[PDB]
UniProtKB/Swiss-Prot annotation, chains A, B:
Ligand binding (FAD): 8-14, 31-35, 47-58, 121-123, 150-154, 170, 174, 190, 280-287, 317-320, 326-331, 360, 458
Noted pH dependence of activity: Optimum pH is 7.6 for isoform A with Trx2 and NADPH as substrates.
Underlying gene: Trxr1
Name recorded for this polypeptide: Thioredoxin reductase 1, mitochondrial
UniProt source species: Drosophila melanogaster
Keyword Signal among UniProt keywords: no
Amino acid sequence: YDYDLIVIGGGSAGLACAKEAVLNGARVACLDFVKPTPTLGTKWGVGGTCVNVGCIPKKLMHQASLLGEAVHEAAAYGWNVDDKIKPDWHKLVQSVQNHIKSVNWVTRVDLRDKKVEYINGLGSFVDSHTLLAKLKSGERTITAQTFVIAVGGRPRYPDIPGAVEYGITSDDLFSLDREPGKTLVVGAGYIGLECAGFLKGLGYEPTVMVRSIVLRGFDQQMAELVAASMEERGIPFLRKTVPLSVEKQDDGKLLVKYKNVETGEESEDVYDTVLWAIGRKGLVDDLNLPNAGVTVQKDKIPVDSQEATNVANIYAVGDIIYGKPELTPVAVLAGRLLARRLYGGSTQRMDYKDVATTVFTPLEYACVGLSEEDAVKQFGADEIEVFHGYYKPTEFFIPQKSVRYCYLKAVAERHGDQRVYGLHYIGPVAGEVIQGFAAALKSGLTINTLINTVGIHPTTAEEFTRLAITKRSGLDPTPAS
Amino acid sequence: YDYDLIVIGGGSAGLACAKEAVLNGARVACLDFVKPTPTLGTKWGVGGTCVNVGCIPKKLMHQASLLGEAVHEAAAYGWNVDDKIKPDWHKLVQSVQNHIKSVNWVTRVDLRDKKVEYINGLGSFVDSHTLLAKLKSGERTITAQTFVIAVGGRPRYPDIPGAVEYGITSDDLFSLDREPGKTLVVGAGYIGLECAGFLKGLGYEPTVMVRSIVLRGFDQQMAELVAASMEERGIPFLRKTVPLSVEKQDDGKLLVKYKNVETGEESEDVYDTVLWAIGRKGLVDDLNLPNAGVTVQKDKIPVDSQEATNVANIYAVGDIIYGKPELTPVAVLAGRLLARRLYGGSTQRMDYKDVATTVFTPLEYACVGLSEEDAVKQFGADEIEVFHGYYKPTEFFIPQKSVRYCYLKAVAERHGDQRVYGLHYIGPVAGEVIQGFAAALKSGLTINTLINTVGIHPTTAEEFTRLAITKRSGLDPTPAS
Ligand SMILES: Cc1cc2nc3c(=O)[nH]c(=O)nc-3n(C[C@H](O)[C@H](O)[C@H](O)COP(=O)(O)OP(=O)(O)OC[C@H]3O[C@@H](n4cnc5c(N)ncnc54)[C@H](O)[C@@H]3O)c2cc1C
Ligand SMILES: Cc1cc2nc3c(=O)[nH]c(=O)nc-3n(C[C@H](O)[C@H](O)[C@H](O)COP(=O)(O)OP(=O)(O)OC[C@H]3O[C@@H](n4cnc5c(N)ncnc54)[C@H](O)[C@@H]3O)c2cc1C
């Protein structure tokens, strides 16, 4: 039709796909709309979830929290720093949002310059080749040759009285007018863990509420070490607990009634803020996919190895895609690769294996490859070797920081090549450490090259090259301390 | 004789060799003596150069300097931090030395526990199987079956009036009674660069004096970016300059006369402290090597691929070894491997290739593999590809930190497998970033796996996986900023 390609959604995948497609000669349009959060009505510019309400504000709040610790440690080194320091939440919000808005503008200019037609409207299918764009002016537009769906998701709400009325989600949190105060974080995935982490670091009082387990999908030894790490720093956890309701009392305070799911313990407590970090739901609803005859696997769209949907002419990429890693660089690269196969004469497909990730908890946890339990399930316990250790960061000594949760692990093939299957690290700058190892795994990293890679001294990254104690041995993982 | 193995020198290599040899059934002795610095008479416990006067105190001073910046940045994030903070040099020295002495004691206990006979004496050869140990009591002892020389070196002094009298070296610096004040750092190797770096960061006024070039042996594009980095932060450099003398004037101040070597410009300036970081000289002198018939290559001992000297029964390892990387983990691992070949029935030799290193300058520089110029010299310019980029750390935005010297580069084979030859990074936590890539290089890292390794977002480590602009292209290395 009017376009070679229409891209539905202007986030990490959408924009990456749109820009790449134009680079290879295509006439392309990209639609992006941001539906305002129910209650509070929070809204943001173009660029998607990461820039506006995801990786970026998250990392900036984490850094702000990290810098407070740095202030407290500086005194141990001889700096005449004052003990009683406090962050200004409105000042922090201000700085964070200033950076985001600057990025928004640059993104818009970059899109125009690269000749990507950005439409600030909500797209819905009329037909496998025809889309209704709904602009601000209530105006509409139609038609294109190929389609890329990169619509992502939005924070879920519990089906519980008071939830959408009194509670907030990550969407709201990063520009919050009100000071968080005492806050209940419902959800022990990374978003809930990270938020609780930096809320404590900035002088507030979070509680994490767990339905079942901490960080589902992650190595559970590591997930429990991160949780215990957080309790060490004064973050309490409510185990096996589900919320029942929240109500605004004539007080300004928020009463939350909750329930143990193993026991039947009905209990309650009062908070200034309630954060629902209970997962995200794909925005398939507003697309009218049946009009295009595209099949859905419940809030998500199943795609083949080429990101094609059951309709040859229509594709999906990023978060709406069923059961693939939901991260920004995954989305960016899959979108770019896609645009390059459609218009660049490329045959390179996306590689969704051994994607590294970092949980930016107070003590960060990075990993890549298999968890211990998945490797044991997949190959058998007696064909698996785990090398592990507790270690001591050079910079933790003078300030006498806890090394209790500074733990490192390599999950590997036991015999033969001794191929590394997974690497797990809790500690300082965990994503900075794991990134290069994720590349090493991708080049076929074995235990032998790992262990004969010379260390960079003094660093915490060199701890991986120092691994020598196996779990099978039963020897102390704390080595001549 | 009396021992299976005598180890001469109780540093990184010596201790690693001694401990490993006992693990494999050997009767071993290890000698260590620390000659006090001329003037000031500085002395330290067992464990060698790194623990006492090297990597460790260096990293701790660097961290102390880093933590001051963190204090200054915290205000941008909303922390009510006070601007006028100052470190206490004696308090910093105190903390650093407390940690070192604690490590000294633990090291002594560990050696006794592992049954390594530590002799606090100076060893010199009488014979290829016989050593004179000289203890504190003026006492002596003799005799053994095999020998490991791991004696390292000590800071060099210029052959110039006033040098040993008024100037200091890294040996003195880390426990300095007097406050450094305005200090002249002669030497632009890493030790001089690192010291100048943390002296500025802790409120003093260093100058770096360069005889010829900055960081000889390192990639010179990178070496100039680090130097310019330091000037940005207010560290001046005296280019093509050699010192002529230093004299104590009735003033307490130190007058240094110097000279341009390209021009003939005789000039002078007054400093509180003068630091000679002009290299280190191997302690071969005190060994009486001719008595054992061991050949020397001028202050260093040449060894074969098995660390054997021209005398079958005698070995050398660590810093005294001719023309190998002079770093702690190199020394530790070569010493361990050696002990394992002598007593463990191992055939594993040391791998001295692709050893990663970090220069802990204010903005750190890590690298591993070939410099750009060595790769071009070795393979030809047209068989070389350089991928490069300037990047922007997420945490630099709010405090509005300079990104001018945040630069990244991958030196690679141009065609075929596109094997990576070298990786270079200036920026935050450079050793934490490079370590895993050093392992990746060792597993055969190519450009294709590098560039299709998914990034961890947001990090500075992910910048390597984002490399896409080549120098050959001539395109702007600052990509849609
Ligand atoms: C708080 C939080 C922290 C995170 N931290 C990290 C992290 O640190 N590292 C990391 O890698 N990832 C992180 N993520 C995940 C990351 O944000 C996502 O994986 C990524 O943004 C997904 O990109 P996308 O293009 O598929 O979707 P999105 O970025 O969400 O973009 C989709 C866009 O399309 C719009 N849209 C939807 N429907 C329509 C329609 N019908 N018409 C027009 N526009 C439409 C949406 O409103 C949205 O603007 C985080 C996410 C959250 C929420
Ligand atoms: C200031 C500075 C910073 C550094 N920073 C780093 C860095 O961050 N990372 C890194 O990897 N490396 C660093 N190094 C290098 C590192 O310290 C050395 O590579 C390492 O210590 C060498 O180990 P070695 O066992 O060969 O010698 P040493 O550690 O010096 O040990 C030799 C010991 O033997 C003693 N000895 C000498 N002769 C005799 C004798 N005749 N009898 C008995 N004992 C004797 C010596 O006095 C000494 O105690 C740094 C060095 C300096 C000086």
